[PDB]
Amino acid sequence: EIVLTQSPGTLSLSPGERATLSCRASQSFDSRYLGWYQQKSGQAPRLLIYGASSRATGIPDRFSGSGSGTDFTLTISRLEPEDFAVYYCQQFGDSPFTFGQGTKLEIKRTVAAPSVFIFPPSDEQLKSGTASVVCLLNNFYPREAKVQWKVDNALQSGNSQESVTEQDSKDSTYSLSSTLTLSKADYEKHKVYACEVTHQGLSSPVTKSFNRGEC
Amino acid sequence: DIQMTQSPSSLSASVGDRVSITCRASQSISTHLHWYQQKPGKAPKLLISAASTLQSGVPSRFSGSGSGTDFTLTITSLQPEDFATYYCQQSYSTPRGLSFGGGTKVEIKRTVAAPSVFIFPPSDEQLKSGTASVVCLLNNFYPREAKVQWKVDNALQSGNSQESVTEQDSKDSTYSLSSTLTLSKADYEKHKVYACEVTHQGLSSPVTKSFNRGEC
Amino acid sequence: DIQMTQSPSSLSASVGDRVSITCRASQSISTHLHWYQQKPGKAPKLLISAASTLQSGVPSRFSGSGSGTDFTLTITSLQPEDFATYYCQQSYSTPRGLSFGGGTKVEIKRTVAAPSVFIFPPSDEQLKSGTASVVCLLNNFYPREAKVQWKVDNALQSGNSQESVTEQDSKDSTYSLSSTLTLSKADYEKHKVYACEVTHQGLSSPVTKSFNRGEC
Amino acid sequence: EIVLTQSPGTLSLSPGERATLSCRASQSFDSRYLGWYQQKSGQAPRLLIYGASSRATGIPDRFSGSGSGTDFTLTISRLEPEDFAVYYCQQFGDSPFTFGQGTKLEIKRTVAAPSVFIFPPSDEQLKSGTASVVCLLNNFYPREAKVQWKVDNALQSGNSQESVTEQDSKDSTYSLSSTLTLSKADYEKHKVYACEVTHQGLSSPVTKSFNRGEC
Amino acid sequence: QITLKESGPTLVKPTQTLTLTCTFSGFSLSTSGVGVAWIRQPPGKALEWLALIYWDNDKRSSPSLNNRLTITKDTSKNQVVLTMTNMDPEDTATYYCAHFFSHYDSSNYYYGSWFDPWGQGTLVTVSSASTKGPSVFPLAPSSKSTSGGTAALGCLVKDYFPEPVTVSWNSGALTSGVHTFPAVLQSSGLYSLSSVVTVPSSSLGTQTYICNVNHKPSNTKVDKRVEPKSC
Amino acid sequence: QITLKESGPTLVKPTQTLTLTCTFSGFSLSTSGVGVAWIRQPPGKALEWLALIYWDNDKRSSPSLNNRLTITKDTSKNQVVLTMTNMDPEDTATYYCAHFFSHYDSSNYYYGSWFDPWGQGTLVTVSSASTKGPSVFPLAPSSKSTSGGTAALGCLVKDYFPEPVTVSWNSGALTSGVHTFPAVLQSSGLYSLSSVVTVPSSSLGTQTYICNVNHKPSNTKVDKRVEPKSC
Amino acid sequence: VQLVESGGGLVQPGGSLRLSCAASEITVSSNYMNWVRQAPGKGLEWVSVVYPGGSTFYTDSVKGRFTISRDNSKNTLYLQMNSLRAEDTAVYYCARESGGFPLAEGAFDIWGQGTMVTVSSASTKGPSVFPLAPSSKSTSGGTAALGCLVKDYFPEPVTVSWNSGALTSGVHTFPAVLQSSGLYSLSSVVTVPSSSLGTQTYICNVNHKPSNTKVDKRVEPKSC
Amino acid sequence: VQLVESGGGLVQPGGSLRLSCAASEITVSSNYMNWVRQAPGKGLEWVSVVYPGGSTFYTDSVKGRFTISRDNSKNTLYLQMNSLRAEDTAVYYCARESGGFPLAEGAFDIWGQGTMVTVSSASTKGPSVFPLAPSSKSTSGGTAALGCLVKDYFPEPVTVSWNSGALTSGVHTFPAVLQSSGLYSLSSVVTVPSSSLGTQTYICNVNHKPSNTKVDKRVEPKSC
């Protein structure tokens, strides 16, 4: 089976500059078997280049392709604000036809620190038999961040869930919410609930906590 | 007329490492390429069929890939009995065009070593009939590449030398070499001093070994 | 069918004297006759063209004359390397009629000498299979002419003798001769005494050399 | 070049007997290339035999020829008094065509001694600045004779001239005149002028002289 | 211009079989070189080609999934039906039908091929749990006076099935900073997300906060009040 | 019967050129196999063939003299002209033109060839000295009484050029024994001969002795008296 | 599957020869059968093919003067080479095309051992044996070499031994080289310590079988 | 001008053979080229001629069964002899007719070295070696002779040596004679003084190359 590896895994470039994407094939096939597709946020993928050098109909001249043997590249000369999406290389060489893992083009910006906020469960959720406390990290760049949960200053692992949102349409920052779910035997068996956050925009990790009893 | 080349001409490899050898066609031949292995003094044996299919009875360490104009034969764990000559043959052109590749030789890799460099004169017994052979012998040198030149009173002797090289031994995995000049009686009798200059990777500087006709 | 003869068949000459050899045709051939020289073990070399024209590179001591039915080749100073066989060839008859002459042999002349005359019996080893060879050997005789006859108890043995003669040596310019009789076992075993009679110019009287079967 | 040698150089035979002449050629040519010509005293040569055996027209049957290879002969069976001349063999084999040196047929006779006479120069020749004295030997046979001049009994060489006449028409003898030419510095510097003659008809040479002063 | 639309059961029970119908317009399955392909994208993963049917009823399937995948065509109705059996919970994905075509030019040179227009896509899930209305728990701004007028407040909609739930803050009169994070599959094959809004602490008790949360498969229309809770 | 006659300059100066014309009658230079040859005879030497011209204007010359010998024919006037250049004193000779012919007989067998009638001959000399009348010196019978009536008396004609001089003794009344020896080329390329008569000493003072010597090229007509001179 | 060869040898240029390939466990008439030649020191070259139906094909170099046939009765393949030239000196292999369990179409899966064919006018004769002594030195690191030069012979192979096989360590025989005069020569050398140069007499034995030359020549250093 | 021959040997009567003449410095097609044969011991005989324009002529004895040709590509002359009979045993010479600087028309100015052709059914085999000892006498003038009789072999040449070349003075080898049985024999004798008959052991070595006979036989007088 032919395996296509894209590079880089993630890519961030502010509008105006040059975008380069690479796709390397495990086996060797004709250069006319490889195409490039672009898929935007929550959209069906659309054809971008076929034959590794033949631009699709209607695609602007900003997209070009160059292929040789087991090395293919997609070049974007002028990249506009509407040109940030995920890019897949796929082959028609051997069955089954396989796509690449993709490459997310990102809108670059200056580094910002995430506001870290904490929200406890409601009385209804103290009534449901399962209580979740949500820890939010907002307005940060880049996407990379780490959060660790502490029940009475004791590290938690395997008992929390994560959800990071997509890039905003106006500020290009990221947001993230992580929930910690427990029962009453755990929620009323301790006092302290804390998030410690490690971000590239923060020189030192920040530990922020709350106590159910005091409030 | 499908020209077919192999890269590299010969590579030296250790035991257990992965090795890849490439075969290139002058034009795309789809997957009509086959890989054969031939040991010295024996007939070739078919390793890979259709450039990707392992043959029955061939160890799984042999694999083949590629298509069109570029093909590759890959060995994962090069066993000590995998040292042979590998040919790529195409069956694409015509029933009268089953050309073969040049062939790739795989031999054991070891540390460099300096040869013993000896000069052997034309002995009187062979000289008595006007047929004189002079010998420059290089003993136990690795790798195979070496340069030998012939010297007579700072003059350069070229165009009539014969080179005989032994293949790698099973004991020390080195090489041996003999360079021979054959000349008629007066094509040696008039001249005075005969030397052989040798150049090897394992030697920092070329070495000259000279002997006098007059002295012995 | 132009018969072509040479005179003499062979002549003996010294070094430096003038020698003439004649070639005669059965009918007039104008001047379409050529003189060739051939040394033993070699190919002929063209000496004289058109019976009068010296060839380029031929020493001036060779000259040719005559016309019609009589032609002559003359050498002024017969050098020591001029001893060879000379042929006259005609190119007159037809494209299928380039006949050659008999040939004239020129050899060194010296003083007469008597040969050693030896008789060699049929040895027992060769006799053990019924094949007996008896030999009469003449050593160092000049000139070439000699007569050899075979005798058995005053009987005459004829019709089965073989003659082997050596050409003139470069040391003494003499000849050697061997006469051999081959007979089956009983074609010799019954008879008693075997002799060889020899006659040479250098010998005043013929000499008989006899040996007994019974004695040895 | 073909060279024809005749033999003998001179030949004397009284009328009635057999005349034989030979001609030998250096090279070998066909016998039909050689002819024989006869030239008399002060006459143009006339053809005698052509083809070495074919008698010319009008020539009497007394002349015959026989040729083979490089040897040719002319035979005269009956030779008459009018048959004494010079005979040439010539060839038409190779250019240039060459004649023989000739053979003078001579009228034989008994041996006779030559009268030896001496005549001095005239006073006019003592006036001309050059004086010649003439010595005459007449009526001798054969043609061979020798004369030596002596000025005061001293042998002379290179200062005299000779002239022998042809055979007479009636007596078949020969005559000869030899002149000695000198100047006055030589003619009046000596006394004796002598001829000594050696002839086959003379047993001993004869010395005969004169002196200018005494006469 | 051509279009393709997928339809079928978006709620498929485990170890059962689904049938998906792609209706296409602008082309017909009779032109040479024209085909209909089915591709799937798992949530958060890369694409994976499933099947491809040609104009001459020639069909190709992924060898690792060809034992349980059948593809059929109806040229008269311009439809392509993909039937897939023996479902597993990891088969949840979004399925596209796409137009497949090649480009030869006057000499049959094959300047490549492509998957041109893809369908809108149907999000199909494989699970056992049935529908369930979301439980809404309001998430309270913390006890801070000003903090530079920076705060966030939300509501958590948890334990709902299936996707999706639509959240609106103050009926479109509060959309500045409303983060509706993508819902996460709970450990029990169930869905839970948080919807928050970034607001200034200087307008805590004077600006109303509501979240109208909607879920058609469960017909859940809950207008949850969010208010500041002190200590 | 055929005739040939030569004509030309009998007095040729050295290192100059002569031209000799042979006029022949009885045949014409048109019959096949007929030629005109030129031969020369040096005084007292053997003959030497010079040139040969054929009926078809084919000419042959002696290779040792072909570089300076030209031969031409005029069939209309029945003439043959030999031009010879670069003369030497040894070229003095008598030149004959002769008829050359061969004899074939009904099968072209060539029964030989010949030089049949030769011309009368022209005596041509090569020298520098011009004409000169002969000097006559009478040669006196010696002082003898009888000697058996045997004596000779003559006159010497010396230093004359060119040939010949004709001597007559007593105008034809004394021809018995008149020896006129052939003239000898003197060392200076000049001519001298003696003319003597054998007479008896018994008629010394009673028989007149004269020699009329004649030389047309010098017009010398001298009737020299010979008389006995005593001591 | 066994394919046993026969028919090799040496021939004069312009001669002829016949090669035989006896197969077992397969049928020669029922398979694609090829003759493939390899020159000594060079690569493989396809020469001829015969189809199961009897159709034949040849490479361009051997057109006309080479023919391929089969005998069904005893299941053999035959190659008749005529007008042989010097470029035909090689090892010839009988191979089965388009076989193997995965059915390697167009590939040779079963090979014979090949016969050797030589085409030269070398006029078979015997090798001369010449000794080679090292430099006249005392120890020079305890390394000396003595050799036997084998010259002017045809054809291969030849056997070279030291002390009739009594010495087998450190012996290096070099492959014979084709002289421009059409003869063969090689050198067989061996390294011994100098201290053993005297106490151990050495003799080089050359056994050239085709010319029946059994030559043993002494190997001792010289006096300079 | 060089004319190099090739193609000689021995053949059975009724066989065939091809002779080659490779010329240099001249063109075979542009000259009159002749084959001229000479029997061993007899005179030269003209065999065949080929004209520059390709016309050919043959002598009467070889009409029909002999043909002459040329190859322009490599400038060679060829003689194909078929139905060979015993009268064709001779040395054959390639000659150029009507050449030479003075233009010897009708004459052969350039000759090859000639090849040897033998036509007999002698069934090639080996020579027997027989010793010959002189009369049992003391000195008899100090003249004795000992000989080696070499018998019953085909074809020529053979090598005869005395003491393996140690004796070379006074040795007389006689030319081999063709026996009526189609074999060859000769005698190689040598004269030595009688005083050296005992002190000098003699051995006659006969090396017949085509039959590979290497026979050394002792040569000593006998006891009568």
Side-chain angles (χ1 to χ4, degrees), chain C residues 36 38 44 96 126 133 139 164 166 176 216, chain H residues 38 60 108 111 130 151 172 174 191 224:
Chain C
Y36 301 82
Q38 179 194 41
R96 305 145 74 261
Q126 65 182 357
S133 289
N139 189 359
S164 301
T166 313
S176 293
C216 189
Chain H
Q38 181 177 43
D60 278 355
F108 318 99
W111 296 70
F130 311 142
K151 199 103 199 163
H172 290 185
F174 302 121
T191 298
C224 301

PDB file of all heavy atoms in Angstrom, chain C residues 36 38 44 96 126 133 139 164 166 176 216, chain H residues 38 60 108 111 130 151 172 174 191 224:
ATOM      1  N   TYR C  36      62.335 -15.837 -61.851  1.00  0.00           N
ATOM      2  CA  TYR C  36      62.068 -15.798 -60.422  1.00  0.00           C
ATOM      3  C   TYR C  36      63.162 -16.541 -59.671  1.00  0.00           C
ATOM      4  O   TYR C  36      63.734 -17.512 -60.176  1.00  0.00           O
ATOM      5  CB  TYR C  36      60.724 -16.448 -60.071  1.00  0.00           C
ATOM      6  CG  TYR C  36      59.518 -15.829 -60.730  1.00  0.00           C
ATOM      7  CD1 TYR C  36      59.171 -16.161 -62.029  1.00  0.00           C
ATOM      8  CD2 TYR C  36      58.715 -14.932 -60.046  1.00  0.00           C
ATOM      9  CE1 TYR C  36      58.070 -15.607 -62.631  1.00  0.00           C
ATOM     10  CE2 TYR C  36      57.610 -14.375 -60.642  1.00  0.00           C
ATOM     11  CZ  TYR C  36      57.293 -14.715 -61.934  1.00  0.00           C
ATOM     12  OH  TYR C  36      56.189 -14.160 -62.536  1.00  0.00           O
ATOM     13  N   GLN C  38      63.838 -18.400 -55.865  1.00  0.00           N
ATOM     14  CA  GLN C  38      63.183 -18.949 -54.684  1.00  0.00           C
ATOM     15  C   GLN C  38      64.215 -19.681 -53.843  1.00  0.00           C
ATOM     16  O   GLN C  38      64.845 -20.633 -54.318  1.00  0.00           O
ATOM     17  CB  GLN C  38      62.048 -19.896 -55.069  1.00  0.00           C
ATOM     18  CG  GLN C  38      61.339 -20.516 -53.882  1.00  0.00           C
ATOM     19  CD  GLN C  38      60.463 -21.686 -54.271  1.00  0.00           C
ATOM     20  OE1 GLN C  38      60.842 -22.512 -55.099  1.00  0.00           O
ATOM     21  NE2 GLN C  38      59.280 -21.762 -53.677  1.00  0.00           N
ATOM     22  N   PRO C  44      58.834 -17.589 -53.987  1.00  0.00           N
ATOM     23  CA  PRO C  44      59.666 -17.055 -55.071  1.00  0.00           C
ATOM     24  C   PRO C  44      59.648 -15.536 -55.107  1.00  0.00           C
ATOM     25  O   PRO C  44      58.696 -14.888 -54.666  1.00  0.00           O
ATOM     26  CB  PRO C  44      59.028 -17.645 -56.334  1.00  0.00           C
ATOM     27  CG  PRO C  44      58.242 -18.816 -55.861  1.00  0.00           C
ATOM     28  CD  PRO C  44      57.766 -18.465 -54.491  1.00  0.00           C
ATOM     29  N   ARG C  96      45.055 -19.164 -69.185  1.00  0.00           N
ATOM     30  CA  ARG C  96      45.048 -20.449 -68.495  1.00  0.00           C
ATOM     31  C   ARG C  96      46.283 -21.269 -68.853  1.00  0.00           C
ATOM     32  O   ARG C  96      46.257 -22.500 -68.837  1.00  0.00           O
ATOM     33  CB  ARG C  96      43.777 -21.234 -68.815  1.00  0.00           C
ATOM     34  CG  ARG C  96      42.489 -20.484 -68.524  1.00  0.00           C
ATOM     35  CD  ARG C  96      41.404 -20.820 -69.538  1.00  0.00           C
ATOM     36  NE  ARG C  96      40.850 -22.154 -69.333  1.00  0.00           N
ATOM     37  CZ  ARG C  96      41.200 -23.227 -70.029  1.00  0.00           C
ATOM     38  NH1 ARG C  96      42.106 -23.164 -70.990  1.00  0.00           N
ATOM     39  NH2 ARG C  96      40.625 -24.394 -69.753  1.00  0.00           N
ATOM     40  N   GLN C 126      62.721 -53.677 -32.988  1.00  0.00           N
ATOM     41  CA  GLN C 126      61.832 -53.447 -34.125  1.00  0.00           C
ATOM     42  C   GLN C 126      61.513 -54.748 -34.853  1.00  0.00           C
ATOM     43  O   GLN C 126      60.484 -54.840 -35.532  1.00  0.00           O
ATOM     44  CB  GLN C 126      62.419 -52.434 -35.112  1.00  0.00           C
ATOM     45  CG  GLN C 126      63.685 -52.880 -35.813  1.00  0.00           C
ATOM     46  CD  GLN C 126      64.242 -51.813 -36.742  1.00  0.00           C
ATOM     47  OE1 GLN C 126      63.654 -50.754 -36.909  1.00  0.00           O
ATOM     48  NE2 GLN C 126      65.390 -52.086 -37.338  1.00  0.00           N
ATOM     49  N   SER C 133      63.780 -52.788 -40.687  1.00  0.00           N
ATOM     50  CA  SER C 133      64.378 -51.726 -41.482  1.00  0.00           C
ATOM     51  C   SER C 133      65.890 -51.872 -41.440  1.00  0.00           C
ATOM     52  O   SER C 133      66.476 -51.981 -40.359  1.00  0.00           O
ATOM     53  CB  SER C 133      63.963 -50.346 -40.966  1.00  0.00           C
ATOM     54  OG  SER C 133      62.597 -50.084 -41.234  1.00  0.00           O
ATOM     55  N   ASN C 139      78.022 -40.636 -45.306  1.00  0.00           N
ATOM     56  CA  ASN C 139      78.231 -39.414 -44.542  1.00  0.00           C
ATOM     57  C   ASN C 139      79.296 -38.547 -45.203  1.00  0.00           C
ATOM     58  O   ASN C 139      80.408 -39.018 -45.469  1.00  0.00           O
ATOM     59  CB  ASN C 139      78.630 -39.739 -43.099  1.00  0.00           C
ATOM     60  CG  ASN C 139      78.655 -38.510 -42.206  1.00  0.00           C
ATOM     61  OD1 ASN C 139      78.403 -37.393 -42.652  1.00  0.00           O
ATOM     62  ND2 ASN C 139      78.963 -38.718 -40.931  1.00  0.00           N
ATOM     63  N   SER C 164      66.999 -40.877 -48.772  1.00  0.00           N
ATOM     64  CA  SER C 164      66.842 -39.603 -48.081  1.00  0.00           C
ATOM     65  C   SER C 164      68.172 -38.866 -48.117  1.00  0.00           C
ATOM     66  O   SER C 164      69.172 -39.365 -47.590  1.00  0.00           O
ATOM     67  CB  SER C 164      66.377 -39.809 -46.641  1.00  0.00           C
ATOM     68  OG  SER C 164      65.149 -40.509 -46.600  1.00  0.00           O
ATOM     69  N   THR C 166      70.260 -35.081 -47.597  1.00  0.00           N
ATOM     70  CA  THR C 166      70.279 -33.747 -47.017  1.00  0.00           C
ATOM     71  C   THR C 166      70.878 -32.751 -48.002  1.00  0.00           C
ATOM     72  O   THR C 166      71.783 -33.078 -48.774  1.00  0.00           O
ATOM     73  CB  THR C 166      71.083 -33.735 -45.716  1.00  0.00           C
ATOM     74  OG1 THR C 166      70.684 -34.840 -44.897  1.00  0.00           O
ATOM     75  CG2 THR C 166      70.851 -32.442 -44.947  1.00  0.00           C
ATOM     76  N   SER C 176      74.709 -35.738 -47.238  1.00  0.00           N
ATOM     77  CA  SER C 176      74.506 -36.952 -46.465  1.00  0.00           C
ATOM     78  C   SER C 176      73.376 -37.743 -47.100  1.00  0.00           C
ATOM     79  O   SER C 176      72.461 -37.163 -47.693  1.00  0.00           O
ATOM     80  CB  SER C 176      74.184 -36.642 -45.003  1.00  0.00           C
ATOM     81  OG  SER C 176      75.299 -36.070 -44.348  1.00  0.00           O
ATOM     82  N   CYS C 216      75.462 -60.849 -35.888  1.00  0.00           N
ATOM     83  CA  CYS C 216      74.843 -59.769 -35.129  1.00  0.00           C
ATOM     84  C   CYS C 216      73.745 -59.086 -35.939  1.00  0.00           C
ATOM     85  O   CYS C 216      73.980 -58.647 -37.064  1.00  0.00           O
ATOM     86  CB  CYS C 216      75.897 -58.742 -34.705  1.00  0.00           C
ATOM     87  SG  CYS C 216      75.313 -57.496 -33.540  1.00  0.00           S
TER      88      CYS C 216
ATOM     89  N   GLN H  38      52.555 -25.418 -55.320  1.00  0.00           N
ATOM     90  CA  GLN H  38      53.815 -26.116 -55.538  1.00  0.00           C
ATOM     91  C   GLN H  38      53.808 -27.382 -54.701  1.00  0.00           C
ATOM     92  O   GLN H  38      53.710 -27.311 -53.473  1.00  0.00           O
ATOM     93  CB  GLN H  38      55.004 -25.227 -55.167  1.00  0.00           C
ATOM     94  CG  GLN H  38      56.354 -25.870 -55.397  1.00  0.00           C
ATOM     95  CD  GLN H  38      57.496 -24.932 -55.090  1.00  0.00           C
ATOM     96  OE1 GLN H  38      57.474 -24.219 -54.090  1.00  0.00           O
ATOM     97  NE2 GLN H  38      58.504 -24.926 -55.952  1.00  0.00           N
ATOM     98  N   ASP H  60      43.436 -26.617 -65.857  1.00  0.00           N
ATOM     99  CA  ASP H  60      42.565 -27.717 -66.260  1.00  0.00           C
ATOM    100  C   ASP H  60      42.377 -28.747 -65.154  1.00  0.00           C
ATOM    101  O   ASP H  60      41.306 -29.355 -65.055  1.00  0.00           O
ATOM    102  CB  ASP H  60      43.118 -28.385 -67.516  1.00  0.00           C
ATOM    103  CG  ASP H  60      42.739 -27.642 -68.780  1.00  0.00           C
ATOM    104  OD1 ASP H  60      41.967 -26.666 -68.684  1.00  0.00           O
ATOM    105  OD2 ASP H  60      43.212 -28.035 -69.867  1.00  0.00           O
ATOM    106  N   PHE H 108      54.400 -12.307 -61.454  1.00  0.00           N
ATOM    107  CA  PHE H 108      53.995 -12.205 -60.056  1.00  0.00           C
ATOM    108  C   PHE H 108      55.107 -11.508 -59.281  1.00  0.00           C
ATOM    109  O   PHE H 108      56.206 -12.053 -59.134  1.00  0.00           O
ATOM    110  CB  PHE H 108      53.707 -13.585 -59.476  1.00  0.00           C
ATOM    111  CG  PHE H 108      52.954 -14.489 -60.405  1.00  0.00           C
ATOM    112  CD1 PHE H 108      53.617 -15.451 -61.143  1.00  0.00           C
ATOM    113  CD2 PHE H 108      51.584 -14.382 -60.535  1.00  0.00           C
ATOM    114  CE1 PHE H 108      52.926 -16.285 -61.994  1.00  0.00           C
ATOM    115  CE2 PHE H 108      50.889 -15.213 -61.386  1.00  0.00           C
ATOM    116  CZ  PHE H 108      51.560 -16.164 -62.116  1.00  0.00           C
ATOM    117  N   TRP H 111      54.303 -12.000 -53.321  1.00  0.00           N
ATOM    118  CA  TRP H 111      53.902 -13.349 -52.956  1.00  0.00           C
ATOM    119  C   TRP H 111      53.580 -13.423 -51.472  1.00  0.00           C
ATOM    120  O   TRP H 111      54.163 -12.705 -50.656  1.00  0.00           O
ATOM    121  CB  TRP H 111      55.007 -14.367 -53.267  1.00  0.00           C
ATOM    122  CG  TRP H 111      55.335 -14.521 -54.712  1.00  0.00           C
ATOM    123  CD1 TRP H 111      55.956 -13.613 -55.514  1.00  0.00           C
ATOM    124  CD2 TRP H 111      55.083 -15.668 -55.528  1.00  0.00           C
ATOM    125  NE1 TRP H 111      56.097 -14.118 -56.781  1.00  0.00           N
ATOM    126  CE2 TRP H 111      55.569 -15.380 -56.815  1.00  0.00           C
ATOM    127  CE3 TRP H 111      54.489 -16.911 -55.295  1.00  0.00           C
ATOM    128  CZ2 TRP H 111      55.478 -16.286 -57.865  1.00  0.00           C
ATOM    129  CZ3 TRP H 111      54.400 -17.808 -56.337  1.00  0.00           C
ATOM    130  CH2 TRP H 111      54.892 -17.494 -57.606  1.00  0.00           C
ATOM    131  N   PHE H 130      63.376 -46.159 -32.949  1.00  0.00           N
ATOM    132  CA  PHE H 130      64.285 -47.308 -32.961  1.00  0.00           C
ATOM    133  C   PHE H 130      65.746 -46.868 -32.956  1.00  0.00           C
ATOM    134  O   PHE H 130      66.127 -45.988 -33.740  1.00  0.00           O
ATOM    135  CB  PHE H 130      64.023 -48.203 -34.182  1.00  0.00           C
ATOM    136  CG  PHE H 130      62.575 -48.560 -34.386  1.00  0.00           C
ATOM    137  CD1 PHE H 130      62.041 -48.639 -35.659  1.00  0.00           C
ATOM    138  CD2 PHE H 130      61.742 -48.790 -33.302  1.00  0.00           C
ATOM    139  CE1 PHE H 130      60.719 -48.962 -35.850  1.00  0.00           C
ATOM    140  CE2 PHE H 130      60.419 -49.113 -33.486  1.00  0.00           C
ATOM    141  CZ  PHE H 130      59.906 -49.200 -34.761  1.00  0.00           C
ATOM    142  N   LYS H 151      59.596 -43.685 -37.199  1.00  0.00           N
ATOM    143  CA  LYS H 151      58.835 -44.483 -38.148  1.00  0.00           C
ATOM    144  C   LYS H 151      57.337 -44.270 -37.964  1.00  0.00           C
ATOM    145  O   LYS H 151      56.863 -44.016 -36.854  1.00  0.00           O
ATOM    146  CB  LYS H 151      59.170 -45.974 -37.975  1.00  0.00           C
ATOM    147  CG  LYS H 151      58.816 -46.857 -39.142  1.00  0.00           C
ATOM    148  CD  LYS H 151      60.058 -47.209 -39.942  1.00  0.00           C
ATOM    149  CE  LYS H 151      59.709 -47.691 -41.339  1.00  0.00           C
ATOM    150  NZ  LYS H 151      60.882 -47.647 -42.255  1.00  0.00           N
ATOM    151  N   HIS H 172      72.734 -35.057 -38.352  1.00  0.00           N
ATOM    152  CA  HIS H 172      72.137 -34.960 -39.679  1.00  0.00           C
ATOM    153  C   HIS H 172      70.763 -35.611 -39.623  1.00  0.00           C
ATOM    154  O   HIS H 172      70.653 -36.826 -39.419  1.00  0.00           O
ATOM    155  CB  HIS H 172      73.020 -35.627 -40.730  1.00  0.00           C
ATOM    156  CG  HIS H 172      74.290 -34.884 -41.015  1.00  0.00           C
ATOM    157  ND1 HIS H 172      75.171 -35.269 -42.001  1.00  0.00           N
ATOM    158  CD2 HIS H 172      74.823 -33.781 -40.443  1.00  0.00           C
ATOM    159  CE1 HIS H 172      76.196 -34.435 -42.023  1.00  0.00           C
ATOM    160  NE2 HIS H 172      76.008 -33.522 -41.087  1.00  0.00           N
ATOM    161  N   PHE H 174      67.440 -36.530 -41.745  1.00  0.00           N
ATOM    162  CA  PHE H 174      67.106 -36.616 -43.154  1.00  0.00           C
ATOM    163  C   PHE H 174      65.632 -36.307 -43.374  1.00  0.00           C
ATOM    164  O   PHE H 174      64.798 -36.587 -42.508  1.00  0.00           O
ATOM    165  CB  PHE H 174      67.429 -38.008 -43.705  1.00  0.00           C
ATOM    166  CG  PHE H 174      68.869 -38.400 -43.551  1.00  0.00           C
ATOM    167  CD1 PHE H 174      69.224 -39.523 -42.829  1.00  0.00           C
ATOM    168  CD2 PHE H 174      69.868 -37.640 -44.129  1.00  0.00           C
ATOM    169  CE1 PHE H 174      70.552 -39.878 -42.684  1.00  0.00           C
ATOM    170  CE2 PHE H 174      71.195 -37.990 -43.988  1.00  0.00           C
ATOM    171  CZ  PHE H 174      71.538 -39.111 -43.266  1.00  0.00           C
ATOM    172  N   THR H 191      77.540 -38.671 -36.063  1.00  0.00           N
ATOM    173  CA  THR H 191      78.848 -39.303 -35.995  1.00  0.00           C
ATOM    174  C   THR H 191      79.588 -38.818 -34.756  1.00  0.00           C
ATOM    175  O   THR H 191      79.715 -37.610 -34.531  1.00  0.00           O
ATOM    176  CB  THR H 191      79.667 -38.995 -37.252  1.00  0.00           C
ATOM    177  OG1 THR H 191      79.001 -39.532 -38.402  1.00  0.00           O
ATOM    178  CG2 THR H 191      81.061 -39.599 -37.148  1.00  0.00           C
ATOM    179  N   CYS H 224      77.195 -58.258 -29.501  1.00  0.00           N
ATOM    180  CA  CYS H 224      76.930 -59.199 -30.582  1.00  0.00           C
ATOM    181  C   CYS H 224      77.449 -60.593 -30.249  1.00  0.00           C
ATOM    182  O   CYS H 224      77.057 -61.189 -29.246  1.00  0.00           O
ATOM    183  CB  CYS H 224      77.556 -58.697 -31.882  1.00  0.00           C
ATOM    184  SG  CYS H 224      76.948 -57.079 -32.412  1.00  0.00           S
TER     185      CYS H 224
END
